[PDB]
Ligand binder design. Structure first.
Ligand SMILES: [Cl-]
Ligand SMILES: [Cl-]
Ligand SMILES: [Cl-]
Ligand SMILES: [Cl-]
Ligand SMILES: [Cl-]
Ligand SMILES: [Cl-]
Ligand SMILES: [Cl-]
Ligand SMILES: [Cl-]
Ligand SMILES: [Cl-]
Ligand SMILES: [Cl-]
Ligand SMILES: [Cl-]
Ligand SMILES: [Cl-]
Ligand SMILES: [Cl-]
Ligand SMILES: [Cl-]
Ligand SMILES: [Mg+2]
Ligand SMILES: [Mg+2]
Ligand SMILES: [Mg+2]
Lengths: 94, 94, 94, 94, 91, 94, 92, 91, 94, 94
């Protein structure tokens, strides 16, 4: 099942610069795994913005929740989740 | 380049049914052509709603504008256009 | 899996009263079938308003979409859909 | 009487880790008792968010207020409360 | 139980004038009985607006729903409902 | 003349317990005084929230501003003020 | 008592032309009176829009309400009302 | 030319008492000068809130900008600026 | 002085076709004159929309008001106006 | 490709005068270069606010994104990006 997921990142200014670097690296490694495995299907950045606009391909809401909750950035994210359906006019794969 | 495009459809209440069925057919035919040609890259239906969420891959704003203005549904659409950029953490193709 | 679904009903003021009564009877019959078959899991009235707050239990976004699209009231509904996940603190049935 | 209640949780970043862990266990024990007793009728996780959607079954607005005010998380919650009425098309339990 | 209820009225421009007079009289008669009985506890008009801001006192959500749905104006109202609780500092 | 006033409270997290309780005590005392004198005509708690919905009965906007300013909570309140007029269909007290 | 009042005007497209010119003349005459009295204290037009942004100067909310309800345009107006208080830094 | 200006004030919670005092004093002195000179034409308090609604009378957008930027409170203000035009019904 | 002006066009669906043609021709001729004279300094279309986003250069708010009020499309426009100032970092023309 | 870009600036309250002076200087120098090279086509101040309205002229969304990310002010900016198209009624340069 497909979901459109928007994430806005607000890392705190008083965040320790050294922890910030560890967080950033952990986040990148985690999104790599998830893209390689296919759950994180598309990953784009809205032009001019931090954060991402993505499509996830997972088999349940619970799975999507666990993936998002697991992200190192989660405590600093604002997330919007929108289910996507097959469009009858679609030519090719969803 | 990539654009995330949301469209919501509000067809007039007083549309003659013979016109409405042919308008829907022409819209579907036009989106088919655009998907086949590659400009309309992804097309999804907003779950529970008469609209679509799409990704267009076109070479200019003017090209996207002309494509949207061309749609049979255009006079009845509410459209939001968001430019998408490459995410540095992307694994694979944009 | 579960979805929280809000629906608000806006029937046209010019609706033939006989057609309005037929439409309402059709809507009520359709929601009965969907509740008996288990997809329409919970159904409440929004106090003071002509609408409902519901919980649907289906196997895909597409299933939910087809169900909502099929409702006799669909052309007159404003619908919001939100996925729900199992809460780790839940004691009892979902 | 039933109420739909949305809660979003924003724990302070400067929360002492032992304070936080015990706050989390206290919250879970409290929601457990309220669910066992029936006042907290349904509880779901908002997919992708630190929060919940709940249905409470209590005898008065005052009873609901006291329950919410008493939750360990209350000082860190954003709460929305909406009364629910019995829907005439309901087949099955509320 | 108390509820704060806001109502905004939008009567259609194409309402038959006689029908509009009758509707207004029916609405006023209905709010009169509900206020006399106590369920419609307070009724104010928002300054500058064709609406009301009210407090209802009823025994359940279902009772309030039936009362609101019963109003002659219901098809033309935008309604917001908010539960009110006793304030511990109330004197 | 009558005003509907909504207040939401956001106390600082960094208050010593003694200063927090003193603040809450001063607030309660101030609201008691205004209620006894009649300027604070009605006072209700928003179910599930730390705030109030109130009706003030005062002789000028200037008087209302000074009253609201004078509340110990003022520096921590979000306030909305709405003038109320006598309703021609009213039967009973304002 | 001072109030900041915003009004946006939406006349029906199907208004009889004669009736519409009459309504406009009645509105202008009514605002003239209220301005002469000082109750409609300031009257401006938001640049680019059909309506007004105004300050009213009246004794009570109820008086303001009757004034607004009285306007020939009232059925076609969207109105926002905000109370204004004396500012301690005001000079004059 | 006239402008309707809304200002909402959010002073830092960490300001020194003495420093905040001086800052408020500087703000009040600046608004006094601007009102005496006529550029700050009207100044009202938004009832119940720490803000103001103002009308400015200046000769260009650039002049208004320089005036607002100069306010001691500027870093702590949220400002909305609306150009006002002469109303044909103004007496 | 300069103003950013956004305009969205909503022509009635019940316009006689000749009237609509004349209206469009009149609008285009009026915007031509204003651009040639310099009051309408810049004119762009928001991609995907029937409107424009423009910069006007006029000597007063009243002058802008009269120009906008003059437009044949005025009754069908939603307009937003915001003042622009010379930016101290600008290199090149305004 | 033209883009309309709004930026609002929120500099940290704790920057000392020399930090602030240097950051502003760096931002000004960066915008100078971008204007000289033609990517930053128009630049105006938002009257009464610490911000700007700009028109950028670049060959891809990614080019704009890298330019915005490169600004000294970027961590402190709120940015909105809107694609612009050529308007059929335009007389003059874009
Ligand atoms: Cl990200
Ligand atoms: Cl699930
Ligand atoms: Cl579609
Ligand atoms: Cl282009
Ligand atoms: Cl329903
Ligand atoms: Cl929770
Ligand atoms: Cl009413
Ligand atoms: Cl309170
Ligand atoms: Cl007007
Ligand atoms: Cl009054
Ligand atoms: Cl102020
Ligand atoms: Cl246009
Ligand atoms: Cl002017
Ligand atoms: Cl800037
Ligand atoms: Mg007209
Ligand atoms: Mg048309
Ligand atoms: Mg604006």
């Amino acid at each position: 099942m497909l979901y459109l997921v928007r994430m806005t990142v607000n890392l705190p200014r008083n965040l320790d610069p050294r922890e910030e670097e560890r967080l950033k690296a952990s986040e990148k490694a985690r999104s790599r795994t998830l893209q390689e495995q296919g759950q994180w299907r598309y990953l784009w950045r809205t032009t001019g913005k931090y954060g991402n606009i993505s499509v996830f391909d997972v088999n349940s809401h619970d799975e999507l929740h666990e993936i998002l909750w697991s992200l190192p950035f989660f405590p600093y994210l604002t997330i919007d989740v929108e289910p996507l359906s097959h469009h009858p006019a679609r030519v090719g794969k969803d």
